[PDB]
Design a protein around this ligand. Structure first.
Ligand code: 4VV
Ligand code: 4VV
Ligand code: NAG
Ligand code: NAG
Ligand code: NAG
Ligand code: NAG
Lengths: 532, 532
């Protein structure tokens, strides 16, 4: 049977799914780990014990325990990111979309979801791999991983909660793909890992971590990189935040054993309710429980690893969206609202920059403000709003990514860079937010091919281009067709630093993506803060 | 007789001079001070003892002892600024141009020459007051003052060389104008002092100094203001430089009396030869012997005086030239030449900024470099050259002036601001230097009215406009004609901050002159250097 696959962990029974007037195979909710419940909470993931009989893989699994967005109840813009399945600590499963008829050995793509390491699901509508699997004839896998304290609580030295276990969740799924994707018609030596935001940073972290490298071939990073200021913390800071989480739940704080025991006793939602109380500063774009620089998963500091070329040498395809910051300002910055144009005054701009550059002293805050203020028109609401949008985007996503790409390209075997700046016609968020964080995903997963979702014809065409770029790159290391008549996406080089726009218009090549601002964020401001 | 004038100091005999196919009176080389020779060197100026008989005032006096530019021998561009008369320590004289027939009581304008407090002459061709006196029917006076160590050697505490004596030279000439200009047909209650660069700073210093205020009515400041970083030094720094000058001339340095005695023994040219050896840094736009903040001429620091409104409240007309920095880069910065386009490399740009911001630490130098570099096109020779030109101009002339004007306008009784950006058609300096420091003077003194000097018709028209602005302002406090059909030069206000361009084109009003860069030089960089 086509829906019956025998793996090293046991037999699995899939389901046949309709896709654009055709059909493909779907293997949903396959376990790759033992349930991390009870005393296994905060622990490293253990491999799933093989099962006798046939595993029912016809429906989506549970989503991992996480915070749920309730800011705009009923609004699709915010609820498209919320878990669409029952939540449970028993959530370590993966999903596989397989073309019909089954391939022998074809390109594999593995999706790692974002959500600031505090949220996310593999089961989201925008992550439905059936369109990409069908159109580009790839085997598409979406993994899951523990988020929040459950996945990233870090008490370094302790073996019961060492930190980074969410990253190890991903690794074990990559291990399972390596070991078992052959039986689904996938090529284990041609696996691309790709992810957005926290997933993009995760991808970059698997490039860096020695234990992770051999488990994939190539990498795609969307709106995230490992060196993002929100993507990791020191062991001390991780320790501090875990102790503080215990303080919020009336735990015995005399030792790690006392603390971990207390936290393992608390219901999932008790941890989630007080999670955000441990952040050290009044901030936006910062998350409580994230990867730690532990000396194991990351041997040394990320920067020293990047400088010495201590990482996997392969091809990477990466890029950013035009307005990465808007989503975070709306949710956490004064003066921003969903139903207004959110024209920001100087006072709110100044509040914004503070929230937005938490680790800065007064001189640092003055430097940022000077860098992003038109002092000829400083009371312009639009300019203050867009300037603040640029600050959050540049500091958190673009400039960290630009530093990663420049460092990686020294030692790597091919880099391709994009700038996604098409604003979707059918998008429910207000105009001022622009090309929002995470809204290239729908084009990557081919949602514009579905008429019911109300995209334009040119948006369908863009989606097909992007999908073909992603899948051709996954196959070859090059998003371009070999001898094709279409305009070529040029290689990113240390010298020329070329990149393309990604929109409905004819391709344009530019150079030095946001270099003026990123020299500020990567070279000048760090020098300023270190001196003062 | 029209050329015979009886003053409080004695009788004076002038000369009749041809001016644009007409004639006016000229009283040249009138003494207002006792010769500051011998033991009077470095001393405060004493008033000229009245004389019996008739003083011969038909020829220009001696110029004060100063450095002579020999970089381009024969070249008019550099030698138009050199002394055109025999040099002598006996140089404290003034020159008066009087309309014919003699006026009863008319507007007086008093010119104070520039030259970095180390050079300058009242007798220069570009300072010939006959054109302005004739065309606008004003009494034009040009004073002289001691420059270099002779005028500004400062050993605070000592009464033999107290410092600021060059400023007091100017004051005593203003005193003489106050007391005697009535006999030449000038109105002593309608005297405007005006000057360029060091003369512009001097004018601003007479606005600040309590001892100077009552001696004039209104003020015009050209390409200079009192708060310029090159325009003054502390008492300690002045003391340090005077001791170091003695060290260069093998002086006994055991006391001020020993030092001053030694320096008074040295021939004038011996002081001039080693003058530039006392500068503390490797720099451009810095001069050895300048005004000191002494507690007398300036009661407190200039900034605190400006903030508390401790200055003369009257009308001011002031402004800057487009390319103030070029003259200084040519003479002192690597990569700049008179006979090439002077395209500057990154290495020479970086050398430039160092020379150019002497009192800055490494973080400060990085801030300036970031502020003026297009990081998309950083190897552009033209952009590096023009950027450096802007750095020198902004830091030394425009931003200091913009800080002065903004502070003054709070308490003043009317401000008028200009931006002179017309490049003369007949100008001998290379193209890259643009609208050079000091090259509005010729338009102010009406040289384009003389056909032999080869200006265009539109340059003659501009000159007549500028002269009429200057003279109407001197007369009324307003450069505009009351009920005139010509477009109005708007008042500079704290709120609107309006200014005009000054060129051959129809008048354009702008706002906030170079505010982006001047917020950097006046607000941010000072905060940076004070922290580090
Ligand atoms: O414990 N975990 C989380 C929380 N705890 C208390 C409050 N809450 C904070 C969530 C705010 C994080 C900013 C996220 C807003 N934008 C940006 C990208 N996606 C966003 C919405 N997606 O629905
Ligand atoms: O002792 N006094 C002076 C000196 N001693 C040694 C050398 N020399 C330094 C003179 C350089 C000052 C820069 C001036 C160049 N530009 C700018 C404006 N005018 C200029 C030229 N005018 O001819
Ligand atoms: C697998 O699960 C679905 C829904 O829970 C059920 O309808 C279907 O019959 C199942 N198929 C099996 C066990 O073969
Ligand atoms: C990638 O590596 C191959 C084989 O080692 C080499 O021949 C090729 O030039 C490399 N490509 C790039 C872009 O570095
Ligand atoms: C004043 O000086 C000039 C030149 O030195 C001389 O020719 C002229 O005769 C003098 N006039 C007098 C003293 O009346
Ligand atoms: C100048 O002062 C006069 C008289 O004190 C006053 O009436 C006038 O408004 C002032 N003008 C300005 C521009 O401040």
């Amino acid at each position: 049977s086509e829906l019956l696959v025998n793996t090293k962990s046991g037999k699995v029974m899939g389901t046949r799914v309709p896709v654009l007037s055709s059909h493909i195979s779907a293997f949903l909710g396959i376990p790759f780990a033992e349930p991390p419940v009870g005393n296994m909470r905060f622990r490293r993931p253990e491999p799933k014990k093989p099962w006798s009989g046939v595993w029912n893989a016809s429906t989506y699994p549970n989503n991992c325990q996480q915070y749920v967005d309730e800011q705009f109840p009923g609004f699709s813009g915010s609820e498209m990111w919320n878990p669409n399945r029952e939540m449970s600590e028993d959530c370590l499963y993966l999903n596989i979309w397989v073309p019909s008829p089954r391939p022998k050995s074809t390109t594999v793509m593995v999706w790692i979801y974002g959500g600031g390491f505090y949220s996310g699901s593999s089961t989201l509508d925008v992550y439905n791999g059936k369109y990409l699997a069908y159109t580009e004839e790839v085997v598409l896998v979406s993994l899951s991983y523990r988020v929040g304290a459950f996945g990233f609580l870090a008490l370094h030295g302790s073996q019961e909660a060492p930190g980074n276990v969410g990253l190890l969740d991903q690794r074990m799924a990559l291990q399972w793909v390596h070991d078992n994707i052959q039986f689904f018609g996938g090529d284990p030596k041609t696996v691309t890992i790709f992810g957005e935001s926290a997933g993009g940073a995760s991808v970059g972290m698997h490039i860096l971590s020695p234990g992770s490298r051999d488990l994939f071939r190539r990498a795609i990073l969307q709106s995230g990189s490992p060196n993002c200021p929100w993507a990791s913390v020191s062991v001390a800071e991780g320790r501090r935040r875990a102790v503080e989480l215990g303080r919020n739940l009336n735990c015995n704080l005399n030792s790690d054993e006392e603390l971990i025991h207390c936290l393992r006793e608390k219901k999932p939602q008790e941890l989630i309710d007080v999670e955000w109380n441990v952040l050290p500063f009044d901030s936006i774009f910062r998350f409580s429980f994230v990867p730690v620089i532990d000396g194991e998963f990351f041997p040394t500091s990320l920067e020293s690893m990047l400088n010495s070329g201590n990482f996997k040498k392969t091809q990477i395809l990466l890029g950013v969206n035009k307005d990465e910051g808007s989503f975070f300002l709306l949710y956490g910055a004064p003066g921003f609202s969903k139903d207004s144009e959110s024209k920001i005054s100087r006072e709110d701009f100044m509040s914004g920059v503070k929230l937005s550059v938490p680790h800065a002293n007064d001189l640092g805050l003055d430097a940022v403000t000077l860098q992003y203020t038109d002092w000829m028109d400083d009371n312009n609401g639009i300019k203050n709003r867009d300037g603040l949008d640029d600050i959050v985007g540049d500091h958190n996503v673009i400039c960290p990514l630009m530093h990663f790409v420049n460092k990686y390209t020294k030692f790597g075997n091919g880099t391709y860079l994009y700038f996604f700046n098409h604003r979707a016609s059918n998008l429910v968020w207000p105009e001022w937010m622009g090309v929002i964080h995470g809204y290239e995903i729908e084009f990557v997963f081919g949602l514009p091919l579905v008429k019911e979702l109300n995209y334009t014809a040119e948006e369908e065409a863009l989606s097909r281009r992007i999908m073909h770029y992603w899948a051709t790159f996954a196959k070859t290391g090059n998003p371009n067709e070999p001898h094709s008549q279409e305009s070529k996406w040029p290689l990113f080089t240390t010298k020329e630093q070329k990149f393309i726009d990604l929109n409905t218009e004819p391709m344009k090549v530019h150079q030095r993506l946001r270099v003026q601002m990123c020299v500020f964020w990567n070279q000048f401001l760090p020098k300023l803060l270190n001196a003062t």
